């Protein structure tokens, strides 16, 4: 009965969000309408964690959707399977400040936050065995870095011993699609590494190249970029909804793959992935998925674990296989790649096996991986940030409705410190 | 009318041929019991008088 | 009169328990529901279910077992799937939040919540029991409740009890495969409850395990449900003494007063013959020669360590089925006098030979062969101290520069645990190098 | 239906109560006791009653 | 390939995410004192006296 | 021959009464119209009902209750619901206005134009009567008719017939769950008026019952009808020995005598074992030694009271069914070498046990299970003055500013009774601390 | 065999008064032509509380109608559900001031109250047991306030053993709509503490303030206020009319709430109250019904409870429920928020559980509050009564007709020993 809220902030949070929430209705076969239309016990067996009974059949997603400007949310509700969200579970304010971080966490981050509380608290009183909270929302803008930011700050005061997990859309190392980008990120990962127990840092460049390089597909769209992500969004709480030979949940994940408390964000990576006329061509087995989740332009990060080092790894696999075989292969991938693992931990890489996988599918896997190489996602920032905060490019905004050069320069700071920390247990010796 | 009543009492499909079977099953148990008691009956009805 | 409560902790115990109680259910002709179909049993007379199962008096047969997990996830498989019905309903003790591999959340915050309850359900199986004779004890090393609630509720049994014997089936983590990451951590800080409040530890291996499957039973795609049930198999035959008759036969307090020389050397390995496909015990014959020369093999231990490189202390022997005891002074006389065994120079006899002639049963579904006769070799040896050390380099390795700490002290746990811990263990190792010199 | 009971919700088989429905109406129905057609069944062994 | 799979792309398949569908023991077991409860057998009789 | 009169009074008195006369048909086969079932037989003697049923002769199974109301609403539901066939029309009677929660109306206004007419009824069901054995008034001393006129009609009863025993279900209001502001105020002013007309006050809780349904029968959610049924429990197991026959009986004139001590102590607690749902009821053997440990345990009493906290003085125990009087002595003899369970030093012996072998009877749709053994334990410890002193302190917060005191003035009281029942309930402390010393 | 007689004075009460008839004759089956068209005999059995079986199987309201001017009796004749009642008791002056306490207390009222008088006798000699009356009057105006006392005045004198409320809608700052309020509140609430037994105190801008955040409605026009006010008018009758596990009827509030004789002005409040979009989207049970009604947002009274002590709270709970949540949710109540419950009173809650919810709903509650918070109204009221006497304005269209600014003064300073005494008792410890 551990159960989870969802909470969306920012457009690209909403978007994703609704993404997710429809795909997971479609694996727990909950109609467009909110009532079930599935084909086995399985699904109501834990359908509690996201979803909660309205008397008269209807379950209601358990998930906040906030957003400072009545946007991306009148999408949601006008798309298809937007009627199960709660009318109610919709925060809006009359304004919308958009790519400022300063005016989404001080000025009009403010005045939202309160009802934006409520509603969780809500939410968690709804709740009996709660779990934690999963924010979904992207560095570089002004409700999905600033109000985002705030309500995991505010939560964190609030709940500070329940799971917190963020989904944080990073900027991309090419193409910019925001010019206060840095600004943002920066401002933004200053309170997600003191804030969050968990950190997913995914990149639009790396998505579209998976889009590209492995699914063919012509024309990606950000309906199958969304996809991809809530795909690894199912997967990574697979064993809270089915049950499995080898359980973990959120906090078990957090345990095994955080060696220290700074060190918390994580490459995701979903990885039955086949090209459409490569269908024909491949044998959906436990050694490709392997293969295919442990290759390097899988990555939904820019970085590149091959340059850096992998402290931890956790590899969530759906389906009714083997756990000989899935154990043999987490053991060869180290014991032939033992350069990108270090050394000083052994055998880093956890396995969660789950009986159900994806409808559709055979078998399935998910990849969550603490390397030392999403330090170069940090000094990109860094520099990038260095590069307009040397003649205070876009900062008369950010003094005007209310912040000092201090807040920039502890948050530059705090990315240096992070980046050093990331090196120096990359390049740390055994004994 | 008809009146919404609920179900309560209403068998699957396959329970329904289940109900059958097993009591065809339990029938024809209890008579090839039968059938060994009565070459019991008949072996020993010629020894005893044979004595 | 006898009985033997069994608890199953964590996930792998009640994995290993579900495996357990289809196998004692098959073997006393204990249908799902709850009773027997017909009233005498091959082998043992009558109350032969004894030692696992109770009767309510209405002709219910209750399990004396108690299936805790600090996680609703499989308990609930176990209430709602096959043997719904055969479980009582409050044996089965569930809590709301894993340890998530944590032996600070297992044994500080969240075991003490339902520590009492799975107490008061052993006290209130123990009522019912005549005269209680073990206390079978199911979990594995990887951390959790398995780890940490199994160290709590031990310390809290051995408190308890104590003129009882407290037996343990550990799944003892394999030197290179393992399925997480602070197993080292759990290991070392749950070692020292196995050390001080085990009368005996059975500790396997899940890649010894899965070798001899791959090689034996000729499964090239092992499993979960076969490991548990090469483990319920061992179990089974330690156990049948109790329940079954036979001849020359070993209880708890025979076997391990028979089996170990010192307090703290209570450590044995543990190995199981014929492990056997069908299609191969076609061509095999299946002798008691073969089947204890098939326990003395290097590969065919459940934990990874090689027993040529230590001196072997003791040896219990469990026969079962077609065995007589000419053949079993026969393979023993086979045994002792083979150059690559050899044993420690203060135990002149070193076997102890329990005999049973009731075969052992297999499963549907299952995967070991029919055989005639078997045999489970449990050997006090020095060797075992393999394991200990390489345990103790993957945990020096992860502490040098102070890995995943921060959990275990936050979640109320002093960082001196873990140095004490790993002071304990090295004793361990230092007696059972300089017991067999 | 392995949880903690509800006999609001459980009347009715599953659907709950009915409308315009009171406690002792739907409780106090003045059912007999009823004897149990255990013809399918397989009746356990009888143990005997205190005064055998 | 030809055109009509889009039709057959509707069909039911046989689906199996779930695995095999586990057998179930019947509930056919009821202890004697609540089977046998409330049951009594009434008979009339003569008994005569000298 | 031994019957006993019911007296229902009060909403709780009369939902009380539908539970415990739908238990009492169900327990002799009577139908709800009142007729034997012909066709159908229950089994059992040939007065084995005349306890509490009255025989018109062509069948007609008029039961010996009274219920009596100041609202025509519970009482009229019964005369609607599907046992409007079985009651005297003139058994079930109703008042015009409401007693309003208040002592002074129900006592000194609203009772006095109806108490004629209802010891005019039982006048007429006593003359019917050929020896009674006792009246057995439910009620609750929560407040209105089951406080007012239920003391008036005891101290009217007191004064007409004497001798014979009235014994009392009170439905005693909880430390910390009640439904009425001046529950203090009307359950010391009933209780002062009980305390010198009452033979034996048996009283049942709550909070406490919905603690037994939460812990023991697995409701979530309980209703007052799952409460009242485990009340028609306890009075079916007081009356059982008088109703059917077997080993040790005990009638209800010298169940006093035998339980309590002196002529102010009377008010004895109740316990039910066992109280088990149908799920976790046929996976246990229910042993005597079990349910006397079910009855003895702490958190089982029917009244939120810790046992603990005070030394016993009587213990009347009334087991049903496959109950042998070697177990019974068994059981109290472990009882009496356990140390927690502690006695008052002048009672040696403080058990009076009573054995019936006629099980305790199901409902249909119901709750309870089936069960071949069942004990019903009423208890005299001195550890209700914990709830006596928790009245008396509500009693001092609401008395100190006069609160909810006009409503009991200006309906017939003076401002003395409220200072004399809290004298006199200063003085039952004081008699209890005097027992316990 | 209990019963009420109701009286509607003055607009106000003429409105508010069919909305309550109207709904309870839906709950009764009564047609608006006043033939039974239900489907229970519950529905028929306790019909004798409010209706009088006439020749022919129709069913009339006991209700009496009165208002100074005769349009808003032609309008209630008018609306839906208005040709139900009789034409005998529909008591019309000629002339009438409206908005003048003294010209609807001394002059023209002194003579309509005779009439009015007439029909209340034979109303209430035209019963068996005669539970007692019930005003749905409201302060502000000249005959709801002036002629309002006066009958309340005349029916204490006449039958001083009979319970008795009035509900009142009194005056309000924001909505105002009046000049004469507090002359019209000031010169009747004395007259409300001397005679009436329960008054439950409704204010329009709560009302409205429901009808805005609890239930959007987009536009609440007067039919949802009413509409409001009538659920809670059917909500305390509910355990005279329908049978219920728990039974509490206006004598057992009046004795379970008031501690002492002046303190019987209530605050009451309804739930559960959803906008009409999310209605299928909430779990209706006993715990958020306890969570509706334990808000200050929900009260219909315009104080803050949160700015004083409750005294004693009545829940009227109505649908199958279970006791137990009922009695510990009351209790979480108390033991949270213990500082706002008065010490020297324990467990300051009354209970009714009815079996019958109202239609529509599956799971209802009705709330009453004794709060010492009830003295801001009291305060406000007397603030702007003495802002527009410290110097005489709108005086002489009060003097004129013999009235005596010494009536002016004993009011406002009876008031004002209103006001001390719920000071004294919030401020009151268990010393
Ligand atoms: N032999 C065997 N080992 C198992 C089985 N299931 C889990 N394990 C072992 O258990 C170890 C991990 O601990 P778990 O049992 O899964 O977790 P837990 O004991 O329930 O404690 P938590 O982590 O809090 O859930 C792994 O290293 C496995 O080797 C099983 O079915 N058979
Ligand atoms: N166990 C149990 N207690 C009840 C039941 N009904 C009411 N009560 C208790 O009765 C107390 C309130 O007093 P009531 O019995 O309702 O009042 P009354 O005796 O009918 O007299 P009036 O106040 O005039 O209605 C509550 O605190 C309840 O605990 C019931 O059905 N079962
Ligand atoms: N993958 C994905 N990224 C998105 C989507 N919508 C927006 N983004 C990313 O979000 C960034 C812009 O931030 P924005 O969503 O405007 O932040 P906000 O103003 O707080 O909502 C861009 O870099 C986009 O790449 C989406 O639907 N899918
Ligand atoms: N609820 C309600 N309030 C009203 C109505 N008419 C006026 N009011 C309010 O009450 C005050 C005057 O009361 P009024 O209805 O004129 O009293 P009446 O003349 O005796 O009927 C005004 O300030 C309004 O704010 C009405 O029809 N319903
Ligand atoms: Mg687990
Ligand atoms: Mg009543």
């Keep these: 009965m551990r159960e989870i809220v969802h909470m969306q902030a920012g457009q690209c949070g909403n978007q994703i969000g609704a993404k997710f929430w429809e795909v997971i209705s479609d694996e727990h076969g909950i109609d467009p309408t909110g009532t079930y239309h599935g084909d086995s016990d399985l699904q109501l067996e834990r359908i509690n964690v996201y979803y909660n009974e309205a008397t008269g059949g209807k379950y209601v997603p358990r998930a906040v959707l906030v957003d400072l400007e009545p946007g991306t949310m009148d999408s949601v509700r006008s798309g298809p399977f937007g009627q199960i969200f709660r009318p109610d579970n919709f925060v809006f304010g009359q304004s919308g400040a958009g790519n400022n971080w300063a005016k989404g966490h001080y000025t009009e981050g403010a005045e939202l936050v309160d009802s934006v509380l409520d509603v969780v608290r809500k939410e968690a009183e709804s709740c009996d065995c709660l779990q934690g909270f999963q924010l979904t929302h992207s560095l570089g803008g002004g409700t999905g870095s600033g109000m985002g930011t705030l309500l995991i700050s505010k939560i964190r005061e609030e709940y500070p011993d329940r799971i917190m997990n963020t989904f944080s859309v990073v900027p991309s190392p090419k193409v910019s699609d925001t010019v206060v980008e840095p600004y943002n990120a920066t401002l933004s990962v200053h309170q997600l590494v003191e804030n969050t127990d968990e950190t997913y840092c995914i990149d639009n460049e790396a998505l579209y190249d998976i889009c590209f390089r492995t699914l063919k597909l012509t024309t990606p769209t950000y309906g199958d970029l969304n996809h991809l992500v809530s795909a690894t969004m199912s997967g990574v709480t697979t064993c809270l909804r089915f049950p499995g030979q080898l359980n973990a949940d959120l906090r078990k994940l957090a345990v095994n793959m955080v060696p220290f408390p700074r060190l918390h964000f994580f490459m995701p990576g979903f990885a039955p992935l086949t090209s459409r006329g490569s269908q024909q061509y491949r044998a959906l087995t436990v050694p490709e998925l392997t293969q295919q989740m442990f290759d390097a332009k899988n990555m939904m990060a820019a970085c590149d674990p091959r340059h850096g080092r992998y402290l931890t790894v956790a590899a969530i696999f759906r389906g009714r296989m083997s756990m000989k075989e899935v154990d043999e292969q987490m053991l060869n991938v180290q014991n032939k790649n033992s350069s990108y693992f270090v050394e000083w931990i052994p055998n880093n890489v956890k396995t969660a096996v789950c009986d159900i996988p994806p409808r559709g599918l055979k078998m399935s896997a998910t990849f969550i991986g603490n390397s030392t190489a999403i330090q170069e996602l940090f000094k990109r920032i860094s520099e990038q940030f260095t590069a307009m905060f040397r003649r205070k490019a876009f900062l008369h905004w950010y003094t005007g409705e209310g912040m000092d050069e201090m807040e920039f320069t502890e948050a530059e700071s705090n990315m240096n410190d992070l980046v050093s920390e990331y090196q120096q247990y990359q390049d740390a010796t055994a004994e | 009318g008809g009146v919404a009543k609920i179900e309560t009492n209403s068998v699957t499909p396959e329970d329904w041929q289940s109900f059958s079977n097993e009591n065809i099953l339990k029938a024809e148990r209890d008579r090839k019991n039968s059938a060994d008691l009565r070459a019991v009956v008949d072996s020993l009805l010629k020894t005893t008088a044979d004595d | ?437 | 239906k392995l949880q903690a009971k509800d006999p609001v919700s459980l009347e009715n088989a599953g659907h709950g109560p009915n409308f315009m429905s009171t406690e002792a109406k739907t409780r106090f129905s003045g059912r007999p006791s009823e004897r149990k057609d255990c013809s399918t069944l397989t009746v356990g062994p009888k143990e005997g009653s205190g005064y055998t | 390939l030809t055109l009509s799979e889009l039709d057959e792309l509707n069909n039911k398949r046989p689906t199996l995410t779930y695995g095999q569908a586990k057998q179930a023991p019947p509930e056919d077991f009821i202890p004697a004192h609540v089977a046998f409860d409330k049951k009594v057998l009434k008979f009339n009789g003569f008994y005569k006296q000298t």
């Design chain 3, 1 to 437: 009169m006898r009985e033997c409560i069994s608890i199953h902790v964590g996930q792998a115990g009640v994995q290993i328990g579900n495996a357990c109680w289809e196998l004692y259910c098959l073997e006393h002709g204990i249908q799902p529901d709850g009773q027997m179909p017909s009233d005498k049993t091959i082998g043992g007379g009558d109350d032969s279910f004894n030692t696992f199962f109770s009767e309510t008096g209405a002709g219910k047969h209750v399990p004396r077992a108690v299936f805790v997990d600090l996680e609703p996830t499989v308990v609930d498989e176990v209430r709602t799937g096959t043997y719904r019905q055969l479980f009582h309903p409050e044996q089965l003790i569930t809590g709301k939040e894993d340890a998530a591999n944590n032996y600070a959340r297992g044994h500080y915050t969240i075991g003490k919540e339902i520590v009492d309850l799975v107490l008061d359900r052993i006290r209130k199986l123990a009522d019912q029991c005549t005269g209680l004779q073990g206390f079978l004890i199911f979990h594995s090393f990887g951390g959790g409740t398995g780890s940490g609630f199994a160290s709590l509720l031990m310390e809290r049994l051995s408190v308890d009890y104590g003129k009882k014997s407290k037996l343990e089936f550990a799944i003892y983590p394999a030197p290179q495969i393992s399925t997480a990451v602070v197993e080292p951590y759990n290991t070392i800080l749950t070692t020292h409850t196995t050390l001080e409040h085990s009368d005996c530890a059975f500790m396997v291996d899940n890649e010894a395990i899965y070798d001899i499957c791959r090689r034996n039973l000729d499964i090239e795609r092992p499993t979960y449900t076969n490991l548990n049930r090469l483990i319920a198999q061992i179990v089974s035959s330690i156990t049948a003494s109790l329940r079954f008759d036979g001849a020359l036969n070993v209880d708890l307090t025979e076997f391990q007063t028979n089996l170990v020389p010192y307090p703290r050397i209570h450590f044995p390995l543990a190995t199981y013959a014929p492990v056997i496909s069908a299609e191969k015990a076609y061509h095999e014959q299946l002798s008691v020669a073969e089947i204890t020369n098939a326990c003395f093999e290097p590969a065919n231990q459940m934990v990874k360590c090689d027993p040529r490189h230590g001196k072997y202390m003791a040896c219990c022997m469990l026969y079962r089925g077609d065995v007589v005891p000419k053949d079993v002074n026969a393979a023993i006389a086979t045994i002792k006098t083979k150059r690559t065994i050899q044993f420690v120079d203060w135990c002149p006899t070193g076997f102890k030979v329990g005999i049973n002639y009731q075969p052992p049963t297999v499963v549907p579904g299952g995967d070991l062969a029919k055989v005639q006769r078997a045999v489970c070799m449990l050997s006090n040896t020095t060797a075992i101290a393999e394991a200990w050390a390489r345990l103790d380099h993957k945990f020096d390795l992860m502490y040098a520069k102070r890995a995943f700490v921060h959990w275990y002290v936050g979640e109320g746990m002093e960082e001196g645990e873990f140095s004490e811990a790993r002071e304990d263990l090295a004793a361990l190792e230092k007696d059972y190098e300089e017991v067999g010199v």
